[PDB]
Amino acid sequence: WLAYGEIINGRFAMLGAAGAIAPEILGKAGLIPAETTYTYWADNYTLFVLEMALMGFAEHRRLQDWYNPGSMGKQYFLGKEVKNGRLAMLAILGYFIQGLVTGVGPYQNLLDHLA
Amino acid sequence: PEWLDGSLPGDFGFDPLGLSSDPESLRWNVQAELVHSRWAMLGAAGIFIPEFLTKLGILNTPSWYTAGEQEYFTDTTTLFIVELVFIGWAEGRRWADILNPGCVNLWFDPLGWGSASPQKLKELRTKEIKNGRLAMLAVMGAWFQHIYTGTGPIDNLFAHLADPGH
Amino acid sequence: MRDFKTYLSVAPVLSTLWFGSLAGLLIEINRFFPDALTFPFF
Amino acid sequence: FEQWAKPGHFSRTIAKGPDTTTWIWNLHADAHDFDSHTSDLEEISRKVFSAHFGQLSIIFLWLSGMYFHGARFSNYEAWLNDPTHIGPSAQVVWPIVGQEILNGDVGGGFRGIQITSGFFQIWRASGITSELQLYCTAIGALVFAGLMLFAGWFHYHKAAPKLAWFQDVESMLNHHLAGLLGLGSLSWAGHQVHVSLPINQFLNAGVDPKEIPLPHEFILNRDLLAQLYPSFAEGATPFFTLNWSKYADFLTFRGGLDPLTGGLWLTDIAHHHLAIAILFLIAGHMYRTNWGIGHGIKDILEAHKGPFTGQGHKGLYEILTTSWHAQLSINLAMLGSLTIVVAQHMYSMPPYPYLATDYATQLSLFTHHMWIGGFLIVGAAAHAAIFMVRDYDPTTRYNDLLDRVLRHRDAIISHLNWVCIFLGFHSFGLYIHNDTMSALGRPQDMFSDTAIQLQPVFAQWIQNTHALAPGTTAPGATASTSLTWGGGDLVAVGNKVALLPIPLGTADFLVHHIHAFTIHVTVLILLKGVLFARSSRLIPDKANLGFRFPCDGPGRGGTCQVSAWDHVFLGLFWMYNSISVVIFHFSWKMQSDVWGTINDQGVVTHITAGNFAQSSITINGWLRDFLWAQASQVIQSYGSSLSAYGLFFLGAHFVWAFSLMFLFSGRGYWQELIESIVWAHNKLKVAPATQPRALSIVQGRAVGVTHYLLGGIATTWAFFLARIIAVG
Amino acid sequence: PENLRWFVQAELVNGRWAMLGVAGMLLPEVFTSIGIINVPKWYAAGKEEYFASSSTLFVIEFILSHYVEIRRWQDIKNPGSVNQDPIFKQYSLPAGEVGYPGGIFNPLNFAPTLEAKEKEIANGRLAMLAFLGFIIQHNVTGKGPFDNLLQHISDPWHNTIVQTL
Ligand SMILES: CC1=C(/C=C/C(C)=C/C=C/C(C)=C\C=C\C=C(C)\C=C\C=C(C)\C=C\C2=C(C)CCCC2(C)C)C(C)(C)CCC1
Ligand SMILES: CC1=C(C/C=C(\C)CCC[C@H](C)CCC[C@@H](C)CCCC(C)C)C(=O)c2ccccc2C1=O
């Protein structure tokens, strides 16, 4: 719905993707390079973000299949309050921007750090 | 002026009549559906799978020419006329058995029970051996061609990317 | 299903619907025997 | 939930254990409407933007066609490259029974019916280019309907939604300005500068086909546009603090129009759309909301008074807040001319490139884009009625400015009623004379130019001044604000003409004073029937019959057509007589005395003669030379592609015709009838039980209105059309 | 089902004229051999004779026909009829018309008259399916073959509509 209910999760949610775009390095895209070693890519050889289907399906419905009821658990298995959190909604928005809107991994100095 | 009020289910508002939906299917003989949906492609459960095999025909493929009769545009488009009139009278009056006769408006018994009902493991025998087969003609659903004008599923094939590259 | 029956109807677009999804056929036939001009019996 | 019908809906007695046919147009003729619903806003506000919905989801459902049926079968490419000669096309049609020839085969390698109303000119305006492209915008907008039609279900349904914060009216009236214009105007500039400006400036010669700088470019890195109109494009924009002067280059008030193909400058459209852009962004905060900045909602209006005109214009309504009907005239008269304004504007001084020269849309468009306008206003204040006979509650008013009128009726209306003789009666009663004075009346002496002249003259006016206006006086801009006005400073292009000094005179303070008339005795019809409407000085008590309500007494010796609903039932006819006039005057100016061609020795050569001037004075001159001098187009015009306009106004004349049968006719006469036949079914047992009664009075002042009023339109669009194109 | 013992004879009459109808062109039927769309007439003949056209075999042999058929008609109407084969009953034992002259206005019932075997009746209609084979070809394909081990179910050729005729 909800409302109000859909912030905490949004909180945790973007947090990891935001977490992607900071603790990274990175390494592709590419673009600009070359876009698409380990084995090569080992990465299957080409086009495989459809495990996401299953996977990004497998967490959100698997979250909510919850709901405490949770069923989804199941039988067995052995085959100002928008003011606060919602300003917090902004300052997390934001530092996607500067953590993206220039390169971070600068690594421009200053000195050197490894090297 | 019934009822209506009631009318209905008899009121309203606001809920569970429930019978319920609407918004999908379906009350009366939503079993004509049932009884049509099994057969129709249990039928098909034997057209493409023979096909999905033949590519692999170990040593010799098949062969059969005729040995029947050979002349001026001879044989098989004539045709369904005979072939699927025969299996025409087949379809029809087996499955006027949603009930069925006129409930809508010699002897008696056989068999013993209620469509020799069931049994109560054989109800399960029919189960998703009936349904899972129409889970698997969902493979059909998704073309049922695999020849997607696809070249392609040749040189036979079919599949088989896994997925090589280079 | 039944029985004649009756059976069940629906609302305002049935006399209408009849125009389209079936009645068209006409233009197939009228294509099939391009125009008519007059009587082709068989 | 819920729902569904079945008998009975909203006209209280709908089910009635039926008895008769003629309910199937009491329902089809109530259905949307209210009070025969309820003003109980917590279920009527939550219908109006429900809406209001689809109309868009329909408008989307629309536009998502007019590119698929552009970009699935171009004339766009197979022409674009070459404006000028070889022109429009958006439909080609299946090969049934002789459809074919209906899709011409005259468009640059294209079979197909030719197309009137820009679009080619609307999308060669931005740029886009490539069918696989605004076909990549056919899909952009079709689901994109979906979600907007997924708002029906959004609120209302699982969400009986809110009048509490519908009623108020300040956030929205501020935000439309800012909010959802302001996402626009200027956020079309970012588009109109970067996307639009140069994929046009560099179209303006070279750049023929396929290598077409997919808009893809020109973001992050500049250099190219930079290589074009400069601005110094480092990472520091001057006019952050007043280097404004520089990032200009390409937007000083250029006015005139692109003589390398008419339109008029896109170098002349960011300055127009970031100024009128932001007024609407700023000026869309002036009212209350929450944060203590703003104005009266209404608290402004009762601000001021005046002795007579007393209280002033005071305490301005509280349903004006509430709901629609009360309001509902104003968003229409307004929107009204806001489609006669843009009209008398568009042709009047061309937007998107390829108009001025064009025709079959420096006319076409021009119209419709004046029907919708006429239509809209000339049926806007049938909302002043209802309202009084409706949405108006108990009290709010007396001493209101409102009432100051309702008192001063009889002697406000009245003093129009006379103008509406003089102005007309005798100022139309004025071609007449010069017919009685050309037939009978010997050029010797009468009302035309070398006649009831009027020597220099008529001026000029002004306009002209509109032509000293840019050389000083409003210092610059460029070239005379719109060639249409001015002196002899004269252009065009594309062999044929574009716009020029279109000089007026006799033939000009004539005609005119008819639109000048008409839109008098076309209002007051209107006002007579807008004021009296609920209280009429002659059945005094109306709100006792409804909105429509037929007439009443065979008594008082002839009381009929009293309702505004029926004050509206002819409120229209005239509009048609007035919109479906005025168009006319236009299409014999543009042409005959504006369109051109070219040859050379100083000599522009028009579609028709500088006739007009003295062979459209006399009433007649418009059938001598406006019919059988034209129509030839459509008269012959079979076995071809004019082969629809030889096929429309046919069954458009009938269906101007098959009006009067229902509109001149009786009503009891007809019911009286549908027995007789009845005997056939019945005795021979067939017969209904929805007792087949014969169409309800109003209902047939609800057809010879539509039908008349479908009739003499298409007709003239079956007609005016095919004139233009080959002698077009 | 359908209706009441209205016509029986009418269609019976029809089926009577039927078999020997389809016996008629059943000479073209080819014992072995002699067919086509016809012109002639049993065997012989050779009196003086049965002729054309200031004569026609028609009006002579088929004016007098009329009283030979009206007798039956008025025979039906006012029964009237043998003892009683055709309207209706004595032997043995057909498909029963069954009813007597009136209803509840019409329905004190109406049709419990089925039951049995293969039986008498049948062939009466057989010749109208014969017909709707036998008419259809004869101007569409105007000869009647049957031919195994040769080229039955193979064919040979083709032949449609618009050729010309
Ligand atoms: C009997 C029969 C029939 C017949 C028919 C007919 C013969 C018809 C005709 C009729 C006529 C005789 C006429 C009519 C016509 C039509 C029309 C006429 C339409 C319309 C329209 C529209 C829809 C439009 C719109 C528009 C707009 C948008 C605006 C501008 C203008 C126009 C118009 C374009 C039928 C088929 C049914 C069926 C069967 C039988
Ligand atoms: C003819 C006429 C009627 C009678 C008109 C009626 C009842 C309209 C007929 C409605 C439709 C057309 C029903 C006819 C049958 C159709 C629904 C469809 C069958 C035909 C084919 C398309 C299959 C009036 O009521 C009337 C009232 C006031 C002034 C003038 C008149 C008037 O002139």
UniProtKB/TrEMBL annotation, chain B:
Residues at which chlorophyll a 17 binds: 93
Instruction: Tell me the residue numbers annotated for binding chlorophyll b 6.
Output: 89, 93, 107
Binding annotation for chlorophyll a 22: 128
| Chain positions recorded as chlorophyll b 4 binding sites | 38, 93
Record-listed chlorophyll a 25 binding positions: 130
- Record-listed chlorophyll a 23 binding positions: 130
Query: What sections of the sequence does the record tag as coiled-coil?
Result: none
Q: Which residues bind chlorophyll b 9?
A: 107
Residues binding chlorophyll a 14: 83
The keyword ATP-binding is annotated on this UniProt entry: no
The alphabetical list of record keywords is: Chlorophyll, Chloroplast, Chromophore, Magnesium, Membrane, Metal-binding, Phosphoprotein, Photosynthesis, Photosystem I, Photosystem II, Plastid, Thylakoid, Transit peptide, Transmembrane, Transmembrane helix
Q: What is this protein called?
A: Chlorophyll a-b binding protein, chloroplastic
Protein's organism: Pisum sativum
**GN (gene name):** lhaB
Region of the whole protein represented:
74 to 259 of 269
